[PDB]
């Protein structure tokens, strides 16, 4: 069966001068009809204090939290697989609610959502 697909997703910030300005963003994966509980992993090229290190060894920090019913919940350990705490819909049209704080140690950081299939 075809692998899940993820439609382009990007979270925004207008300007803000361990985590400032909680934020809600969703990622909806369209998956196989029989996918089970599979957990995903979020990684980045460079990290620090469990945050994504944007763009010599210093930069901006982006923290990620597993959304909890609109309420910010447990943080996301980068590089560790996790079973989402905010999943809505069917396999054919899933959704993961997450939170993204901010910090520091025109930026366009990238975070890899790893779907490893059993």
């Amino acid at each position: 069966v075809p692998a899940c697909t993820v439609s382009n997703t990007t979270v925004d910030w207008q300007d803000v001068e361990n985590g400032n300005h909680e934020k809600e963003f969703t990622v909806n994966m369209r998956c196989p009809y029989n996918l089970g509980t599979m957990k995903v992993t979020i990684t980045a090229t460079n990290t620090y204090n469990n945050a994504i290190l944007v763009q010599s060894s210093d930069g901006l920090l982006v923290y990620l939290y597993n959304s909890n019913a609109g309420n910010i919940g447990t943080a996301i350990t980068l590089g560790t697989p996790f079973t989402p705490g905010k999943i809505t819909g069917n396999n054919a049209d899933k959704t993961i609610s997450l939170h993204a704080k901010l910090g520091y140690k025109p930026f366009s950081a990238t975070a890899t959502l790893v779907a490893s299939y059993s």
Binding site: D12, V27, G36, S108, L113, V114, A115, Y117, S118
Partner: protein, 215 residues
Amino acid sequence: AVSLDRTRAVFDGSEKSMTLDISNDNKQLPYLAQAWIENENQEKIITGPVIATPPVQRLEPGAKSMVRLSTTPDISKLPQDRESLFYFNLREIPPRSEKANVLQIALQTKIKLFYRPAAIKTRPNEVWQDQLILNKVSGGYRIENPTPYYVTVIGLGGSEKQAEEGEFETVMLSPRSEQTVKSANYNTPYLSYINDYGGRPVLSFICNGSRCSVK
């Protein structure tokens, strides 16, 4: 949105290569598709015995393409009486957002790539997973896979529905190996696994005392 046609790949050892279909289903934007192989332990390998071609490619909106898996000479040094596990990875590089102060989310698909040597070549719809053996032990069951293939188990329970849906720690048993799993004791255990094409069949087990097998 870069998509891959399968959740696992089986490489027929009696073949020199095989292709994987991929596609960018985004209507307006072009995507980059990175492809590469990792070893048994998920470490990237660039010189065989299994290689991914091409390493990087662009897919214009709605475009379709492929990724070729081919083996090198050293592929022969792998056992020919069992499968060797590799991983196929496909990562998308989304068009750089023209926006500012933005965090891009990219998808990386990692699937199991089973190198299955010719001597153990399978036929379509062939089932070997029914050869598993469940041995009751403290905690749960020691599961035995006497076959030459990797077997991924995703469910185990007292009823067929309990095996399909029910908190279970997915486990993959290597060829000719066994592992123990935490589970409640069931008089009629049902095990669910994943076949070559992603289907999820449920097996019915009959326990003769401590040992349970499929009729």
